[PDB]
Amino acid sequence: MGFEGLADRLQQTISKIRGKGKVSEQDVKEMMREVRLALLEADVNFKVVKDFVKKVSERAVGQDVMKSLTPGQQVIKVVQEELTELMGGEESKIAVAKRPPTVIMMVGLQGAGKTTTSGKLANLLRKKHNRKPMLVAADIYRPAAIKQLETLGKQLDMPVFSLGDQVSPVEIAKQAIEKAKEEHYDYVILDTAGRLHIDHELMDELTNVKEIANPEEIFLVVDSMTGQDAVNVAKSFNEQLGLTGVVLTKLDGDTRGGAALSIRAVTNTPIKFAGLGEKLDALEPFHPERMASRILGMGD
Ligand SMILES: Nc1nc2c(ncn2[C@@H]2O[C@H](COP(=O)(O)OP(=O)(O)O)[C@@H](OP(=O)(O)OP(=O)(O)O)[C@H]2O)c(=O)[nH]1
Ligand SMILES: [Mg+2]
């Protein structure tokens, strides 16, 4: 899934280049004003679009136009290459701690998909990597937040560590990680708290949890359909504590892809996984070249 609208807007511009055997410099400029326009309408950060247009234009008006064995193929290769680089190049794999367990801290705003993604990530870790993960209920403030995560764990046959809602998340994380050491769990996934907007009470708690958990990974969970808002959430989260990755949720509803194309360029935090639905299997690793190909109508 993902990017359906941007691909539709770019189909004519790109295909016109693909269908010709000689690309003039006026053709590349004409393609580039329409590519610029499509990226801006897809809510890509406008400074990212500016840098992207210049980088592609400088390379496109080069050896590619003058060599005519496949001039059109070369204009498209550069766009694919630059789209791939923009989104991170190669897939960004989950880190493995030197001493187990590997502790993964899930953070984000309410409604972004934290709790659901924590279950998805555990499921993915056991299936694709044959690890033994433990889930942790560290969101005490919202009722049914614990029972929701427990209900997910009861579908995965995976433990969900909880001490109720009368106990600090700092203490819950401390006990969970130290139980995980004793019983040889590979991964610990902390489902943390969060309201609708960032506040001081939230970073203080998250800073304290990071302090005692000393996590190998801190993943922001953020809603892909919120566009530039998601890019701003990542910037704040990355500067007030340290983000190591991003999970983009609800691409099954994101036709534009602005956040997907903007987050790494603005924050330097890589996007590691994409959420693609409500079910626990709906999580795939973020592959930048495949996304670039899906953007150019080159999908498998
Ligand atoms: N389609 C889709 N949906 C996702 C994905 N990830 C999460 N969701 C939805 O987002 C909503 C919030 O998920 P939570 O896991 O409760 O998020 P939170 O902990 O950050 O609050 C849930 O819907 P809800 O609370 O039942 O309803 P609503 O909030 O959507 O109205 C869930 O179904 C995804 O990858 N694709
Ligand atoms: Mg939640």
Author numbering: 1 to 300
Task: Quote the study's own text.
The stringent response enables bacteria to respond to nutrient limitation and other stress conditions through production of the nucleotide-based second messengers ppGpp and pppGpp, collectively known as (p)ppGpp. Here, we report that (p)ppGpp inhibits the signal recognition particle (SRP)-dependent protein targeting pathway, which is essential for membrane protein biogenesis and protein secretion. More specifically, (p)ppGpp binds to the SRP GTPases Ffh and FtsY, and inhibits the formation of the SRP receptor-targeting complex, which is central for the coordinated binding of the translating ribosome to the SecYEG translocon. Briefly, SRP recognizes hydrophobic signal sequences in the context of translating ribosomes, and SRP bound to ribosome-nascent chain complexes (RNCs) in turn interacts in a GTP-dependent manner with its receptor FtsY, also a GTPase, which localizes at the cytoplasmic membrane periphery of bacteria via a membrane-targeting sequence.
The (Bs)Ffh-NG domain also bound ppGpp and pppGpp with similar affinities as their GDP and GTP counterparts, respectively. We determined the crystal structures of the pppGpp-bound NG domains of (Ec)Ffh and (Ec)FtsY at resolutions of 2.5 and 2.4 Å, respectively, as well as the crystal structures of (Bs)Ffh and (Ec)Ffh in complex with ppGpp and Mg2+ at resolutions of 2.5 and 2.8 Å, respectively. Each of the alarmones could be unambiguously identified by and placed into the available densities. The ppGpp or pppGpp molecules are bound to the G domains of Ffh and FtsY and occupy the canonical guanosine nucleotide-binding site. In detail, the guanine moiety of (p)ppGpp is recognized by the well-described aspartate of the G4 element responsible for the discrimination of guanosine nucleotides by P-loop type GTPases. The α-, β-, and γ-phosphates of (p)ppGpp are coordinated by the G1-element (P-loop), and by residues originating from the switch I and II regions including the G2 and G3 elements, respectively. The δ- and ε-phosphate, which are covalently bound to the 3′-OH group of the ribose moiety and discriminate (p)ppGpp from its GDP/GTP counterparts, point away from the active sites of both GTPases. Both phosphates are not coordinated or form any obvious contacts to the GTPases of Ffh and FtsY. The missing coordination leads to a high flexibility of the δ- and ε-phosphate, as observed in the crystals of (Ec)Ffh with pppGpp. We conclude that ppGpp and pppGpp interact with the SRP-GTPases Ffh and FtsY in the same way as its counterparts GDP and GTP, respectively, also providing the structural explanation for their comparable KD values (see above).
